[PDB]
């Protein structure tokens, strides 16, 4: 990052940029808020349209009935409607309990997402997005929250000639950070997920008995950093 | 029209026996592409506006999972971003 | 000293995406029995929404479950893991579709005319939109970047590494240094395989194994079997099929009879609709976890105390299974 700062600067504000032109071009982005209220609001839609249902009565309001009928031939009919119209919005209820069950699942995995990926670093793989994570910026939204993980996308590949271990005088020496690596002649020892070279001193290497035990182990002269100190 | 769980004896050559049922009134295409109205058993109808022939026209092709990569791994060999 | 031990979990992932139709279900294909069922008004619209909703539910969580690959990976020809054996999980060119020899052993043990019966009384089921096949690749793909690119394939692009190499970032992922894997190397191969012999033996010793999938197929069965046996009650009337009451009856005195036979038949279609719409969400909810889980103990390694297994986590290998997933921890 401090050798890398000002590049990764101009990426994260060119992604911001993409990410509000994304977000200026369709709607079909926010598929999931346009369901939240559109669900609702066709349920309502069709608790309204079961008014207009006969249900087996002779009329469909109940301003209709009692101005024909009376009570004790209409009692049966109100009786029909109200059955009718009750079961309608006992159907309603439940299917808006059912719905605010699933919405309370994804609310609690919104608390979580902002708990881990806003509040901290998640080391969950794909929570937070693709890719390693760095930050997340929640923003609000129509009964909703969108939130923009930066993420950590590694760009460019080169192949190397791994080794798992290294043979000096026959005791192993293996990396206690990174792997070690090959440009074709030279060994290097270099971080995981970033191409650092660096010379194989004691410092980046440890021992650990001998070295004709370990598989796939190599040969190289590891470069103590102390020879010249010491000649003098 | 998708007829489902008919043997398509009633109700040419616009017909495609898929495992759902026969799609009456889409032409198969042999390739496969990203598939977005989901169909049934692998089976996605598309609209494909060609300038060719039949501007107005739905395709019934086997759903494609994606780019069939080869990596190749090696007992030696690594991959370390740059 | 350690031991690998190989632990079997099974998640159900969808259930069969079903469908019902009224005129089907509540009318015995009648005439005046339809009239009276749009007198009701617009509740089979809701039922059919309601299925159609499930049924789109349970398509996006197979494929969000099993999806979370954009490219299909595959093994290399030559097997060279540093002697660590994946011939059983490996996919099998032997059957037509590309399954494992552990996958097999999942299909067999669970096994999904009362079909017919439901058929004809408008109780259909749909097919789902990602068949075994394309399930067992997407789990071959997820197999492939685990085993040669480790867990950079979730991340970004596959990146190729020795398998030997590979675990050698998860031992020093949970404490233990790589050192304590190069130098037994041999004894955790070995372990490895014996641990896959056995959850292969245990696969194939009962069928109490999968007591999850056995579930989510019986209980949706049950619900279809015991909604088809509601059209034999008599719910009021004085008789059960519509056939024979307008063959007994007049309009003026049918339409009641009907009205009986037409609110006990809605009622207990609703009454499934509700159960299978309950059942959905805990099915999603299953999924949601199943998905979570292959996003982390297969494309990485979760630092998350007994969720991937107990014991400290390795790695997972996803397998395809009857309307579900099952991980070998
Ligand atoms: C890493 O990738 C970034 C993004 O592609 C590179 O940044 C671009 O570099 C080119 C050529 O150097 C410039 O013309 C662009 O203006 C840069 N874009 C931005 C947003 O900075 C970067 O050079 C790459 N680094 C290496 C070492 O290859
Ligand atoms: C591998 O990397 C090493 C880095 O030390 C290369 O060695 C030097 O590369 C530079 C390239 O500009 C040359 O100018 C030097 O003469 C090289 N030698 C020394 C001692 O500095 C090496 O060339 C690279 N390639 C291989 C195949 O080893
Ligand atoms: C690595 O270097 C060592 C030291 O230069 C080589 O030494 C071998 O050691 C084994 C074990 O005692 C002996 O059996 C061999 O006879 C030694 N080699 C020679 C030439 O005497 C070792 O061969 C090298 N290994 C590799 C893979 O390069
Ligand atoms: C760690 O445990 C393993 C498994 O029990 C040991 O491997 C066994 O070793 C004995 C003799 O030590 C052999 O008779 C067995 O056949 C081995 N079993 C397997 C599966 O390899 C291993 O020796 C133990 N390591 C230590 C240092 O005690
Ligand atoms: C990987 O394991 C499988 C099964 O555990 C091995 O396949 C067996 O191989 C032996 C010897 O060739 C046969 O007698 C068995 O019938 C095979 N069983 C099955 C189920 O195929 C396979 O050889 C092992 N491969 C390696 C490299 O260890
Ligand atoms: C690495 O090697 C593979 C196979 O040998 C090749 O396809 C790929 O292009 C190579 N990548 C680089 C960066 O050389
Ligand atoms: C198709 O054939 C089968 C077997 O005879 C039969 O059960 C079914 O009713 C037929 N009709 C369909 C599926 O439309
Ligand atoms: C179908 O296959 C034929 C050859 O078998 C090929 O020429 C054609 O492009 C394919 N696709 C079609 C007809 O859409
Ligand atoms: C392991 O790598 C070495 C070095 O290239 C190679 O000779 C050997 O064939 C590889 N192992 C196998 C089983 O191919």
Not at chain 2, 13 to 24: D, E, K, M, P
Not at chain 3, 143 to 159: H, P, Q, R, V
Not at chain 3, 253 to 281: F, K, P, W
């Amino acid at each position: 990052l401090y050798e890398n700062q000002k590049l990764i600067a101009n990426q994260f504000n060119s992604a911001i940029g993409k990410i509000q032109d994304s977000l200026s071009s369709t709607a079909s982005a926010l598929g999931k808020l346009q369901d939240v209220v559109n669900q609702n609001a066709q349920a309502l839609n069709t608790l309204v349209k079961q008014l207009s249902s006969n249900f087996g009565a002779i009329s469909s309001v109940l301003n209709d009935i009692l101005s024909r009928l009376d009570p004790p031939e209409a009692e049966v009919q109100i009786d029909r409607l109200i059955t009718g119209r009750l079961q309608s919005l006992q159907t309603y209820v439940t299917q808006q309990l059912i719905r605010a069950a699933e919405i309370r699942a994804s609310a609690n995995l919104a608390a979580t997402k902002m708990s881990e990926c806003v509040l901290g670093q998640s080391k969950r793989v794909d929570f937070c997005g693709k890719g390693y994570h760095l930050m997340s910026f929640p923003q609000s939204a129509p009964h909703g929250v969108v939130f923009l993980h930066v993420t950590y996308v590694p760009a460019q590949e080169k192949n190397f000639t791994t080794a798992p271990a290294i043979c000096h005088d026959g005791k192993a020496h293996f990396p206690r950070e990174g792997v070690f690596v090959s440009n074709g002649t030279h060994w290097f020892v270099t971080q995981r997920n970033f191409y650092e070279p660096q010379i194989i001193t004691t410092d980046n290497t440890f021992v650990s008995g001998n070295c004709d035990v370990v598989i796939g182990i190599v040969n190289n002269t590891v470069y103590d950093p102390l020879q010249p100190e010491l000649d003098s | 029209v998708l007829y489902q769980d008919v043997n398509c004896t009633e109700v040419g050559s616009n017909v495609f026996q898929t495992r759902a049922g026969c799609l009456i009134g889409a032409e198969h295409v042999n390739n496969s592409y990203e598939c977005d109205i989901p169909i049934g058993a692998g089976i996605c109808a598309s609209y494909q506006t060609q300038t060719s022939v039949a501007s107005q026209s739905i395709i019934a092709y086997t759903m494609s999972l994606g780019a069939e990569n080869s990596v190749a791994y090696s007992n030696n060999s690594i991959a370390i971003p740059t | 000293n350690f031991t690998i031990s190989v632990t079997t979990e099974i998640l159900p992932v969808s259930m069969t995406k079903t469908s019902v139709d009224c005129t089907m279900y509540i009318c015995g294909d009648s005439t005046e029995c339809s009239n009276l069922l749009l007198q009701y008004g617009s509740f089979c619209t809701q039922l059919n929404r309601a299925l159609t909703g499930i049924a789109v539910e349970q398509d996006k969580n197979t494929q969000e479950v099993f999806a979370q690959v954009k490219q299909i990976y595959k093994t290399p020809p030559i097997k060279d893991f540093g002697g660590f054996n994946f011939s059983q999980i490996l996919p099998d060119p032997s059957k037509p579709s590309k399954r494992s020899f552990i996958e097999d052993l999942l299909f067999n043990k669970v096994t999904l005319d009362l079909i017919c019966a439901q058929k004809f009384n408008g109780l259909t089921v749909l097919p789902p939109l990602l068949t075994d096949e394309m399930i067992a690749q997407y789990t071959s793909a997820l197999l492939a970047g685990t085993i040669t690119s480790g867990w950079t394939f979730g991340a970004g692009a596959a990146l190729q590494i020795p398998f030997a190499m590979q675990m050698a970032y998860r031992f020093n992922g949970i404490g233990v240094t790589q050192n304590v894997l190069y130098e037994n190397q041999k004894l955790i191969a070995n372990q490895f395989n014996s641990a896959i012999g056995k959850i292969q033996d245990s696969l194939s010793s009962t069928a109490s194994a999968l007591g999850k999938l056995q579930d989510v197929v019986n209980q949706n069965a049950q619900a279809l079997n015991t909604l088809v046996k509601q059209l034999s009650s008599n719910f009021g009337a004085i008789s059960s099929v519509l056939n024979d009451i307008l063959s007994r009856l007049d309009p003026p005195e049918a339409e009641v009879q009907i009205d009986r036979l037409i609110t006990g038949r809605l009622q207990s279609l609703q009454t499934y609709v509700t159960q299978q719409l309950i059942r959905a969400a805990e099915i999603r909810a299953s999924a949601n976890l199943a998905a979570t889980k292959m996003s982390e103990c297969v494309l990485g390694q979760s630092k998350r105390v007994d969720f991937c297994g107990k014991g400290y986590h390795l790695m997972s290998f996803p397998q395809s299974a009857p309307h579900g997933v099952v991980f070998l921890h």
